[PDB]
């Protein structure tokens, strides 16, 4: 007795090699309710059948099939609920197979199925799509990494690349995906699956520092047809130890969410397309990005990888997208994972370290060093042990201790979770202003090797320190830092996007500035004396904190408590 | 110390220490093992004192002696006192870190401490985490030390921070003390006391056998072979 | 003349990949002239069932005790000419065993006389490993799902040496959700053997054999350890302080909580008995000259099969069935620390 | 006082030196000269005596003054160092005989040689 419809127009989307195409749905219930909704499925062949819950990351609507995303039958047509009449216009990103669009009665809790769509389909479902650059093992090797639907006995990808206008030449890509029983849990190994399709490496090496470079994405048909992406563009990296003004921006805990406005699994970042806003707009002034953490949260709504790349690919198919691992990429109880929380929702590390690169030695660790000009950044990993002993200790101080200050002089640690001091409610009410265990073994290391700054994600808000060395702080200046500062810098700034958290009701010693909203920061390295922070919103990109560090390589080199290397009286 | 640098508390006052510069010593009473800190000393893994630390602990037979109690002035466990919340922290820093193995790995069962003026009492506890949710009648394997901070004997009362943590169970600012009473090998009791009245103001009990102690807990079970 | 060869995967590649893996081959003259050092009879089998199956083997591991010339030098030519027909065209590993490298007051660990007074150089020069010092012979190398760890057995392998903390970096490098499939490979038996000159010595090992490298083997998850040396093949069950870990024979499913080991030895040279004895954890045991094939079908689904060299036909065999969540879990003595907090 | 002396080219690229690089077929040229990376492109073009020639990039990096510790290098003894380029010559043929050249492309589009 509802006699519905809904149909999808247009049903062939993206010709001249466009990969978003908007598309818009009309439908009707002749029953209508204000609880109606419509999702998205790709594959357009989905089954509607209930599978109930079974754990907190298991969410509704509870399809076997999980949509990619839904919304409200009234969202835009607001006489809906009284004429059974609606209209949504959604843009659709490419993520390979086809889209069906479904129409339900009963909210997202007690959902009926009464109509199903027509399918729509992009030109080519296995096109290459959203390439993301990272640093590769070397200064001169950066990495090109993309998804197609073409796996290795489809065609041979590859990259063709070169200096602007210059010659170019095609280099391999290494192939890597994986698969439904690769997800250790629920959602992600259940009712959130979705097929990744194929992740592509290519490593472009032998570059020349601030050189232009071209690139694009190919794959080889056996048929001996090639498939070419649109051309992509970007500046190689400077020299380490280069004079020149570089700028890098970090943040935590962005996420994603849907620009058409549509609701989707896991969508608590309404702050995600402010801050990406801000750094697309400032990009020619940005020259390369560390998302420390926390990164789309999919949490086994596997779609939603994809869905983060095309969020992401303005900013990472021309500047290097640094990422590190946070606790919804990997947390979930008995994989060996430090914290044994289930908010990876099932994915256990495997999409976070497949979908992106970085030049760590064991991806699967997720701990690496890089260098950007006169910064040196050593990476952790808060969701594997971190203590005196563990595997990445001995990783942190070979890195702090291989960086030759003079030529790079500000070194910068990078953490998800906050192994500094931050003074967030759900921190303070379990008698922390840290993780447990978060700073006492490591700010040796971050002493010892005059750590500059230190910054976190995971706490959804930002605050900066006073220089500071066990819970003290060392230099009183809250703005202008000159010479030997005797301690290091910490930063929070984990409101990339992520639902903002509180801050306890205690004012610390060594608690500077806190903001309760959604921001990044940019480093500034004008020269080897001069570094500036700035704190940005992300709702207007403009500066709310800052400070600068003034001061010469012989300050660094200066003894500082817990920092003075041995000597000999003997001449 | 307005200059003493230690040395009337260690001439005018006898303990059975190696070395009584040091002041850290492990001492038995029956039933009870005190295993006592100096907190005016490095306490951290790679340190004298620490490697003390893990020999008194580990040297005690729990069968014949059930009841093994750590000893420190400053907190190096759990407290909410105001000084320490405003510089960050619910301990002294690095208090508890490399300790807390030792108290774990060897089932420490209850841990006190002077230095702050007041009376606090936690949650058997481990990294901050509460490992067995009753208030006042532990049974069997707890899982977790239970500290308590008992600085309240004269000095200045000390102010708590205006937060109430997941593990605090209990808080008095006032002036008191505690007492234990063992009653047999399988039964302790804790009261804490007044001292503008001598009554009882909190308390506890532990009832639990050995075969409860040589249970395994999170950080504390032993290497196992597989062979018979 | 021109030769050609297959570029190895990506690390972590998808793709069915195929690995030959033995002991002990030897050389022979196909011509039946005598020679010194003449007693590897089942060597041009081996080799002959190995090139007949090349188009399905994309690797192979000669696990020690290569040409057996002992000193006669003149063999190690006809060891490279033996083996060309395999080697000019897939990539073919080689360990150091007892025959290449042993000799008195040489620094080797083992005082024999088994090289002949080569003392390693010939094995050292006439092949290429990747080892960062070719006199130490341990490496890692990879073929797509496969990661293995080569020890040298004729130096020492304990806890606090050189060896040992190779090894442990060897182990714990590989990404196991990329690279599911962690063998280990030595010459002599460092795991179980119930060869009868082990027995004899009371022993179901080299002394010394499992007892420092069974604590990484074990935290690591190495999947299986093979070894030459004793000239026959057997087979033990999931094993971990000499008790099995899993009850199998075939059908291997989730965390095994052990490691299998396998004594591949049979390559060529005169074949050894078994002791009188068959302990709980020899599933198989073989008296014949033979080899192993590992097939890695994708990164859940694994094959070994034991082929004899008579006739190349597969005798014994067994399958691993796991995911990455089954590497993840814990076992005994393979459990990761954890924090309480959230 | 005298009067001004100078070389018609005071930037020129001058006085190279080789080190061993990172692997055995590595090598690495380092020189000085008075351009900045702004001022011009370093580059080393190199091949076999006689040979293909190839160019390869440099590596760029300075002091200053006030990176010296203390005096006389901070102070009386300063004086600027212009820009010191480094190129790593890679896949060398062994005892192979080789030769190469400084480079610097001018953003005018000139290339000055050594
Ligand atoms: C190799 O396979 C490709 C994938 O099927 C072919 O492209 C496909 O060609 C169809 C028309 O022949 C067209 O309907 C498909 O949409 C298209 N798909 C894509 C991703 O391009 C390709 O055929 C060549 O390209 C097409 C578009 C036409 O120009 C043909 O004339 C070409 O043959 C196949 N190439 C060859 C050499 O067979
Ligand atoms: C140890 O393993 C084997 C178990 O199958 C035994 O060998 C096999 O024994 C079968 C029945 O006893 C017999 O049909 C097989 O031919 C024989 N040999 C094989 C499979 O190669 C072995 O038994 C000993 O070995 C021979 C000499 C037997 O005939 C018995 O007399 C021996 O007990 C087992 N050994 C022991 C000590 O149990
Ligand atoms: C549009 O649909 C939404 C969603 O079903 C309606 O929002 C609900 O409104 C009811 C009554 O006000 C509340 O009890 C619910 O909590 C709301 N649910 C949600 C998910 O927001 C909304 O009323 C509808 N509006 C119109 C004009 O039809
Ligand atoms: C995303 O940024 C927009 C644009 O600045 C924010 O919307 C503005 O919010 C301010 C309050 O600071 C209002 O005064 C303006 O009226 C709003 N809109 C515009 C278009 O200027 C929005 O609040 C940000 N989103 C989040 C979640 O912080
Ligand atoms: C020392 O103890 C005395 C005796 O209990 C306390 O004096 C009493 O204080 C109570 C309040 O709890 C009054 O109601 C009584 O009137 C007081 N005196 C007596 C003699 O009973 C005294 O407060 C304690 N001193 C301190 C500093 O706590
Ligand atoms: C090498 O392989 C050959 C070929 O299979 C083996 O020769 C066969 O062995 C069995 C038993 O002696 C006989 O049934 C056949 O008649 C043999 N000869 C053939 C088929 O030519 C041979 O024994 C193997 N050599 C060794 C040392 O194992
Ligand atoms: C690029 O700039 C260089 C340097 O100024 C030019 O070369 C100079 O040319 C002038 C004549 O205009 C001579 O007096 C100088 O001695 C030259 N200097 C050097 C270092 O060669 C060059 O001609 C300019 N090129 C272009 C295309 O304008
Ligand atoms: C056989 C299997 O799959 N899992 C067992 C598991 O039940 C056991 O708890 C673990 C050791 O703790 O060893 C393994
Ligand atoms: C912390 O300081 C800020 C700025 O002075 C103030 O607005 C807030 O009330 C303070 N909180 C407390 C508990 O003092
Ligand atoms: C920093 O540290 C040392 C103590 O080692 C102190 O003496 C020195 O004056 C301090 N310098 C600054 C710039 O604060
Ligand atoms: C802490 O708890 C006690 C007892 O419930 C109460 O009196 C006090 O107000 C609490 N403080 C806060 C900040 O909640
Ligand atoms: C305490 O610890 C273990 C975890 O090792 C748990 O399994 C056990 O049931 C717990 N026992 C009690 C009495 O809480
Ligand atoms: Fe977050
Ligand atoms: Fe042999
Ligand atoms: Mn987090
Ligand atoms: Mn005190
Ligand atoms: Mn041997």
Same mark, same amino acid.
């Given at each position: ?55 907190? &990351? ?30 949504? /216009? ?46 590769? @093992? ?31 030449? =095609? ?58 992406? =649109?051309?992509?563009?970007? /500046? ?40 990406? =806003? ?36 303005? $900013? ?38 497949? &979908? ?8 699967? /660790? ?29 990783? $942190?101080? @070979? ?7 003079? =030529? ?97 009701? $205690? ?65």
């Amino acid at each position: 007795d509802e006699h519905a419809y809904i149909k999808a127009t247009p049903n062939v989307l993206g010709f001249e090699g466009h990969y978003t195409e908007w598309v818009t749905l009309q439908y009707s219930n002749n029953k209508p309710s204000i609880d109606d909704w419509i999702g998205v499925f790709s594959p357009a062949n989905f089954s509607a059948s209930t599978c109930p819950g079974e754990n907190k &990351m298991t969410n509704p609507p509870f399809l076997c099939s999980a949509p990619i995303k839904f919304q409200y039958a009234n969202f835009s047509s607001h006489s809906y609920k009284d004429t059974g009449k609606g209209s949504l /216009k959604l843009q659709l990103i490419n993520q390979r197979s086809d889209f069906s669009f479904a129409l339900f009665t009963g909210g997202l809790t007690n959902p009926k199925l009464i109509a199903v769509s027509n399918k729509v389909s992009f030109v080519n479902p296995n096109a290459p799509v959203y390439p993301r650059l990272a640093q590769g @093992k070397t200064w001169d090797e950066i990495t090109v990494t993309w998804t197609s639907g073409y796996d290795i006995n489809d065609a041979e990808p590859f990259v063709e690349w070169g200096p602007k206008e210059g010659n170019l030449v =095609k280099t391999p890509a290494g192939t890597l995906t994986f698969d439904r029983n690769t997800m250790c849990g629920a959602p992600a190994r259940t009712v959130g699956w979705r097929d990744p399709g194929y992740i592509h490496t290519s490593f472009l090496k032998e570059l020349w520092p601030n050189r232009e470079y071209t690139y694009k994405l190919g794959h080889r048909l056996f048929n001996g047809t090639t498939i070419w992406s =649109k051309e992509y563009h970007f /500046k190689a990296s400077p020299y380490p130890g280069q004079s020149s003004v570089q700028r890098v921006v970090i943040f935590g805990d962005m996420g994603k969410a849907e620009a058409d406005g549509s609701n989707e699994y896991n969508n608590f970042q309404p702050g995600s397309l402010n801050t990406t =806003k801000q750094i697309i707009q400032d990009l020619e002034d940005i020259d390369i990005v560390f998302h420390i953490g926390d990164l789309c949260y999919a949490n086994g709504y596997i779609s939603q990888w994809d869905q983060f790349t095309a969020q992401i690919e303005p $900013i990472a198919s021309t500047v290097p997208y640094m990422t590190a691992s946070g606790n919804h990429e990997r947390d979930w109880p008995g994989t060996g994972s430090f914290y044994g929380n289930l908010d990876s929702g099932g994915e256990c590390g495997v999409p976070a370290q497949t &979908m992106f690169f970085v030049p760590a030695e064991n991806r699967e /660790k997720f701990w690496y060093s890089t260098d950007y000009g006169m910064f040196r950044f050593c990476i952790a990993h808060t969701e594997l042990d971190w203590r005196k002993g563990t595997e990445q200790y001995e990783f $942190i101080e @070979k890195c702090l201790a291989s960086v030759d200050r003079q =030529k790079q002089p500000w070194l910068i640690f990078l953490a998800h979770r906050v192994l500094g001091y931050s003074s967030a409610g759900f921190y303070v009410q379990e008698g922390s202003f840290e993780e447990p265990m978060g700073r006492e073994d490591l700010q040796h290391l971050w002493q010892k090797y005059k750590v500059d700054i230190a910054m976190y994600g995971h706490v959804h808000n930002y605050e900066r320190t006073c220089p500071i060395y066990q819970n003290v702080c060392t230099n009183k200046e809250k703005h202008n830092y000159k010479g030997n500062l005797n301690g290091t810098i910490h930063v929070v700034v984990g409101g990339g996007g992520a639902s903002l958290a509180e801050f306890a009701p $205690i004012n610390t010693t060594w608690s500077i500035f806190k903001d309760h909203d959604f921001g990044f920061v940019k480093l500034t390295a004008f020269d080897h004396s001069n570094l500036l922070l700035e704190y940005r919103k992300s709702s207007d990109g403009q500066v709310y904190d800052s400070f600068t560090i003034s001061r010469d390589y012989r300050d660094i080199l200066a003894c500082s408590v817990d920092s003075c290397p041995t000597t000999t009286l003997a001449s």
